[PDB]
Please model this.
Amino acid sequence: NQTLKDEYDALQITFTALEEKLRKTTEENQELVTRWMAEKAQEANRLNAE
Amino acid sequence: NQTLKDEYDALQITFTALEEKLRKTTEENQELVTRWMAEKAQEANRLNAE
Amino acid sequence: SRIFKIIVIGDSNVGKTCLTYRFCAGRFPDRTEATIGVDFRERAVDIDGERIKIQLWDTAGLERFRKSMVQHYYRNVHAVVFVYDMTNMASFHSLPAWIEECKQHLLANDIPRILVGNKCDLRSAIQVPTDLAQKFADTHSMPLFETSAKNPNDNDHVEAIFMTLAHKLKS
Amino acid sequence: SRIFKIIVIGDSNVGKTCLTYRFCAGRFPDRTEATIGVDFRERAVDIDGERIKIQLWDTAGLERFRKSMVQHYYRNVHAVVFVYDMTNMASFHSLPAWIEECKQHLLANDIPRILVGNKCDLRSAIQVPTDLAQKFADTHSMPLFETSAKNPNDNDHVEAIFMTLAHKLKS
Ligand SMILES: Nc1nc2c(ncn2[C@@H]2O[C@H](COP(=O)(O)OP(=O)(O)OP(=O)(O)O)[C@@H](O)[C@H]2O)c(=O)[nH]1
Ligand SMILES: Nc1nc2c(ncn2[C@@H]2O[C@H](COP(=O)(O)OP(=O)(O)OP(=O)(O)O)[C@@H](O)[C@H]2O)c(=O)[nH]1
Ligand SMILES: [Mg+2]
Ligand SMILES: [Mg+2]
Model:
């Protein structure tokens, strides 16, 4: 009924917001890992030059 | 409205599972961030020697 | 070759990386990302015939990416450059917080501190009036420099700023 | 001033970091994480009167942490060390894949390559029989060495292994 409907609707909103926060965190992980790769790649090229 | 009631429950269960995955992902964020700080801190100490 | 440590403090996305890269690489960076921890850039210069290595530390502005590095910043620091975004009043209002961070980590008032406003090329979106930032710069006894990493047309070119700071440090 | 590049290839969690750290630092690393990209570890030695810098590359074993670095591994390589976990048959069965990767990236089939089985101190959990690994080692014309990064106790001490490979390379 009414009261069940709005309860679920509010939970749906929190569910969506919570997903977005997981998306941001996964984005930030990919940023960190890929940036680390750029670091070690440059260092690798420096050493292979010698 | 009984169909709405169990439907709600399933979303709640999926919500809790999503929290668990976001916790692990946030853990991995801290894993990465702290490792970056370690590398940067050592570089700082090397440079602070001069 | 005496080495001078100059740290660059300021909020995130104000243009610290673009200013340090402009001074060291002599060109505006075509692509940047959020600085993690520190980002060290060195440049050799000739001040009054002496060869000096200027060591700019591009500190981070995001609290989650600098909370562990603060005391590495303020160790053996020779000069401090505070930076705000001239197109962001909120970054200007954050300057008292950064000055508090500096004072809490330093007990000596002998080192030169300067205040720099970036992104002055965006003349249509400037939000910090020159008089207000000057009045604040005067309060804490710092020189004010309004400049741009990309195009400071007749407005305090970046190299002139750091050369002035290094010239004052050599004395 | 001669520097010899020795890469360490193998699956994840086999002990590449612990073996390279054991040779360069002389001690077993206590708290270890997944290697991201490469970990470069160098050690200077005097072989036959000549001073030689051994540069070990601790490659990654996780595909998410090594997909972009593969060809950086295989440039100017002087020696390749394959590692498998004696307590993990799956890591042993993955060796043909690494040998193929080594075939596709190398172009000289003479550089010294060795096979190393790690974690032999866990004698209660060894899964790769010595004869099987020895027969495989013979197939690809490599010496087999069963050892442990955590405790070389009267069994192919780590020092002997890398010194043997470097003593080969001086020739
Ligand atoms: N128009 C204009 N944009 C600028 C100027 N300087 C920097 N930017 C812009 O500022 C943005 C990022 O600036 P950054 O140098 O990365 O700022 P930051 O201080 O290093 O940021 P954090 O590392 O996160 O603390 C980019 O969009 C740049 O294009 C400038 O002089 N003029
Ligand atoms: N008993 C025993 N355990 C070992 C030995 N060497 C490594 N380990 C264990 O192996 C685990 C991780 O080994 P690593 O050296 O990180 O393996 P790795 O090749 O660096 O793994 P990746 O970096 O992901 O490719 C830790 O739990 C170590 O304690 C060993 O010689 N004996
Ligand atoms: Mg930056
Ligand atoms: Mg490793």
Summary: Residues 2-48 of chain A form the longest helix (47 residues). Chain A touches chain B at residues 1, 4-5, 7-8, 11-12, 14-15, 18-19, 21-22, 25-26, 28-29, 32-33, 36 (CB under 8 Å). The pocket of magnesium ion (ligand 4) is lined by residues D 16-17, 35, 58 (CB under 6 Å).
